[PDB]
Paper text:
Ectonucleotide pyrophosphatase/phosphodiesterase 1 ([name]) is an emerging therapeutic target in human cancers owing to its role in degrading cyclic GMP-AMP (cGAMP), an agonist of the stimulator of interferon genes (STING). [name] has a role in purin­ergic signalling through the hydrolysis of nucleotide triphosphates (NTPs) and cyclic nucleotides (cNMPs) to their corresponding nucleotide monophosphates (NMPs).
We have determined the apo structure as well as several structures co-crystallized with natural products, natural product analogues and small-molecule inhibitors. The apo structure has only a single Zn atom in both the A and B protomers. Additional zinc was added to the gel-filtration protocol as we found that one of the two Zn atoms in the active site was either missing or not fully occupied. Asn277 adopts two distinct conformations, whereas Leu290 has a single conformer that moves slightly to accommodate bound compounds.
Numbering used by the authors: 105 to 870, 874 to 921
């Protein structure tokens, strides 16, 4: 016979050898390698191995006795008995789980493919049959938004805590904490120091509530967090073959019920490693993608053999995407600063700057000096210096002391360093950029009894996944930055029903009080028809008010969730508002721009009308602002918008509809209300607008207390004034343009948190087309606005709460 089957390593008579010497003599049987050697180095059966005489040094068996001795290769039944593999079976729905005793609550496995950009599945899906089937049979989104910076430790730790890096403390793999005077490195023993890891990873949450955990690698799983390790964890060793990681998890799923985990993790270094080395569009990445596709297949086949393929909930995920770097698209700061030796620059697309003399000069150092030094130096400059607190609030990258006070925002494909010596190869693949860039977006597929089948969900953020995993494991989540219930649409049977938050103190009233018509110091433009009988013009019939309320608060009035705060509803013909006596300012106005409404070019500067519903105050007078070089004022509900006349809406000039405003910000505000709002109103057939001030002096993304606000007032012309840190805008139309904002089945929303700064250095003015770009950069989720104002919107919409949460957590795209 001319085959080695049955005779591996036996000396033979029959002119065809099966011993190691044959190779040198070139007289091996044609199947010698496949039959006798390959089995020492592979985890697969194949037509050469089916019914093999058992070899002692094989990793797994394809011998006839393999099912009895329980060590068949995972693909044994597919290849050697002609059964179908998991990927070959058509989708079938999992309406009831089929689990062994112990899994009354089914297990969840969090499977991470490092650096798997969402685009890889968009484009190479036809080369990835297993992940493609998981998508087809499961719950998929085209894009999961990672956290900023779009790096590995921060995103993995974010996924298992539901926290932004600014709150969980792992902002990068290399950090300096000044209050600890220590440095974090993965090569150091500081990696194991629990001082670094804030929040509560899901394996900790689980342990407190009775469930055990098995992590085969994950950031934090090798650290004693709140005094807890996972019940099973592995010391990181990237050289462990992917197959052995998957086989280990399959061994864990066969432990007896008393010691068998409910929560599992699996981490693979591909395709991040190949992406860095060869670029995201490369033969090496295609091969890496096909390899990880096969490892997912190996898991699914393994689960089928254990009859757990209709039991386990699989979350297939990645931390971040991958971009093509270029030596032509790297910025070196030494060009503008020279070979200075006193600063450390964290290089890459998420570049940060710090003094070398730490912790001594960390707070005293002249950040603003370098910030101004590096601003608007070139035309079409590809980087932008920001003091952390001036970065867009959507990035939630400021609160932590481990975030260097000076950061850089870089354009897509662009990185930054001090000089070419202090960086790795410029032409490599890279990640770290803004978390809304296409190529940074991440993988998400959910498959199992808990998840819906054949569903394509809209973009959601990875900070939402912790709550989802808690629901899948019947866990009460630790407090986190996800909006519990926003991902209920992914689940067959949601376990948490969200409720709209309750107003703590009921709305105070601001009654009309007869008082003297005073001089406010105004040189009003003649065209404006004043309010000559206030009490006449503002004594409204219930019918008249119902009409006004229906037109201006179609979604309900914003509700205040702040504890010690007293607001009152002020009514007008074209807008409503919530006024704060404590801060002498409205917290919010609400109005509606209709398609065919008039915007006036008529000047309305130095013109205010007194509101008799509140006490007159110095800071409500035109005179307080007349030739004032510290602060000016602006209107929330815009006087340029008339429904009745073609002139100026006089009621909009009330003292109660003004906010402190820097003259530089007036350009942005004036351009928005004169030009943009008109274009938006036409494009969307009407726009409901809610605008207001924001006080975030703590730069923690949260509305500050009344108590803390008292101490942040500035003294200008011997008066106490509170100057907003930001202004928020929330635009609301219908998805269907045919209908107007008052009659929408489905809301289309767009929100901004615009920074309130004394100059427009951020936009490098040198055509106001830059105002559009600044609005886009400072876009926010309605949830972001809610958190930073203490307000809660759309509480009167007839939609279920979970659907409203989905809408509020949405970030807009352009
Ligand atoms: C993201 O979610 C986390 C947790 O839900 C939020 O972080 C937490 O922020 C609160 C308020 O700043 C912190 O509480 C406080 O502790 C200090 C120090 O003892 C105390 O003086 C205060 O009175 C208050 O009780 C809490 O420590 C903190 N937790 C963590 C893990 O950082 C964060 O606010 C959320 N971020 C956003 C933007 O919603
Ligand atoms: C990290 O994981 C590595 C890959 O899984 C692993 O490397 C391997 O270690 C085995 C034994 O632990 C080596 O095998 C040699 O030792 C056996 C045992 O007696 C001897 O019979 C043989 O001489 C055999 O050569 C493998 O050579 C080695 N595999 C690879 C690919 O390197 C390490 O143990 C793990 N730990 C660290 C931190 O590196
Ligand atoms: C801080 O660490 C530095 C070295 O990193 C050390 O020389 C110094 O003694 C430490 N303590 C302080 C508070 O400066
Ligand atoms: C910025 O400061 C550096 C020193 O770090 C200096 O070389 C350069 O002249 C300054 N650039 C200016 C004033 O824009
Ligand atoms: C005050 O008036 C002076 C004189 O024209 C002018 O230079 C200055 O800009 C004015 N300041 C403000 C902010 O109105």
């Amino acid at each position: 016979v001319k085959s080695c089957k049955g005779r591996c390593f036996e000396r033979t008579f029959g002119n065809c050898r099966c011993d190691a010497a044959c190779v040198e003599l070139g007289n091996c049987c044609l199947d010698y390698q496949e039959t006798c050697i390959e089995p020492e180095h592979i985890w697969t059966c194949n037509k050469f191995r089916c019914g093999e005489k058992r070899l002692t040094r094989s990793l797994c068996a394809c011998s006839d006795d393999c099912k009895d001795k329980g060590d068949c290769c995972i693909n044994y039944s597919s290849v050697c008995q002609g059964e179908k593999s998991w990927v070959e079976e058509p989708c079938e729905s999992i309406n009831e789980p089929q689990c062994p005793a112990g899994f009354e609550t089914p297990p969840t496995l969090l499977f991470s493919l490092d650096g798997f950009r969402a685009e890889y599945l968009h484009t190479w899906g036809g080369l990835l049959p297993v992940i493609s089937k998981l998508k087809k049979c499961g719950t998929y989104t085209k894009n999961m938004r990672p956290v900023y910076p779009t790096k590995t430790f921060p995103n993995h730790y974010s996924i298992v805590t539901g926290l932004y890096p600014e709150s969980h403390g792992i902002i990068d793999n290399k950090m300096y904490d000044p209050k600890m005077n220590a440095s974090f490195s993965l090569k150091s023993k500081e990696k194991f120091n629990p001082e670094w890891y804030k929040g509560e990873p899901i394996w900790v949450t689980a342990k407190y509530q009775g469930l055990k955990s098995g992590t085969f690698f994950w950031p934090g799983s090798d650290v004693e967090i709140n005094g807890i390790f996972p019940d099973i964890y592995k010391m990181y060793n990237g050289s462990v073959p992917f197959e052995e990681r998957i086989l280990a998890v399959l061994q864990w799923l066969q432990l007896p019920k008393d010691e068998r985990p409910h929560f599992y993790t699996l981490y693979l270094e591909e395709p991040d490693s190949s992406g860095h080395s060869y670029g995201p569009v490369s033969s090496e990445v295609i091969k890496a993608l096909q390899r990880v596709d096969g490892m997912v297949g190996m898991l699914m086949d393994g689960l089928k053999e254990l009859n757990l393929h209709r039991c386990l909930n699989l979350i297939l995920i990645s931390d971040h995407g991958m971009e093509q770097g270029s030596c032509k698209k790297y910025i070196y700061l030494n060009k503008y600063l020279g070979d200075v030796k006193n600063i450390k620059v964290i290089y890459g697309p998420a570049a940060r700057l710090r003094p070398s003399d730490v912790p001594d000069k960390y707070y005293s150092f002249n950040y603003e000096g370098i910030a101004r030094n590096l601003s608007c130096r070139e035309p079409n400059q590809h980087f932008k210096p920001y003091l952390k607190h001036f970065l867009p609030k959507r990035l939630h990258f400021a609160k932590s002391d481990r975030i260097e006070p000076l950061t850089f925002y870089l354009d897509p494909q662009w990185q930054l360093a001090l000089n070419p010596s202090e960086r790795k190869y410029c032409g490599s693949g890279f990640h770290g950029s803004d978390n809304v860039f296409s190529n940074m977006q991440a993988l998400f597929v959910g498959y199992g009894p808990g998840f819906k089948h054949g569903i394509e969900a809209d973009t959601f953020e990875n900070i939402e996944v912790y709550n989802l995993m808690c629901d899948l494991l019947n866990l009460t989540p630790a407090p986190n930055n996800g909006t519990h219930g926003s991902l209920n649409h992914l689940l067959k049977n949601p376990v948490y029903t969200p409720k709209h938050p309750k107003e703590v103190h009921p709305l105070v009233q601001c009654p009309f009080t007869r008082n003297p018509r005073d001089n406010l110091g105004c040189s009003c433009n003649p065209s404006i028809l004043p309010i000559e009988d206030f009490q006449t013009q503002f004594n409204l019939t219930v019918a008249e008010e119902k009409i006004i309320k229906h037109e201006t608060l179609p979604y309900g009035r914003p509700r205040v969730l702040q504890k010690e705060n007293t607001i009152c509803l002020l009514s007008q013909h074209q807008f409503m508002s919530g006024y704060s006596q404590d801060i002498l300012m409205p917290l919010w106005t609400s109005y509606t721009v209709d398609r065919n409404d008039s915007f006036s070019t008529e000047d309305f500067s130095n013109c205010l009308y007194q509101d008799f519903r509140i006490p007159l105050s110095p800071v409500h007078k035109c005179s307080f602002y007349k030739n004032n070089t510290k602060v000016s004022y602006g209107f929330l509900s815009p006087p340029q918008l008339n429904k009745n006349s073609s002139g100026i809406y006089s009621e909009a000039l009330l003292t109660t509809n003004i906010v402190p405003m820097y003259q530089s910000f007036q350009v942005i505000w004036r351009y928005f209300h004169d030009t943009l709002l008109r274009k938006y109103a036409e494009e969307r057939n009407g726009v409901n607008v809610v605008s207001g001030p924001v006080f975030d002096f703590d730069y923690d993304g949260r509305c500050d207390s009344l108590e803390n606000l008292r101490q942040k007032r500035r003294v200008i012309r011997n008066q106490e004034i509170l100057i907003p840190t930001h202004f928020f805008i929330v635009l609301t139309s219908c998805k269907d343009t045919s209908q107007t904002p008052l009659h929408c089945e489905n809301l289309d929303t767009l929100a901004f948190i615009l920074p309130h700064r004394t100059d427009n250095s951020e936009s490098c003015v040198h055509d106001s087309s830059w105002v559009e770009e600044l609005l886009m950069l400072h876009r926010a989720r309605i949830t972001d606005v809610e958190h930073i104002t203490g307000l809660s919107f759309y509480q009167q919409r007839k939609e279920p709460v979970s659907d409203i949460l989905k809408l509020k957590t949405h970030l807009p795209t352009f």
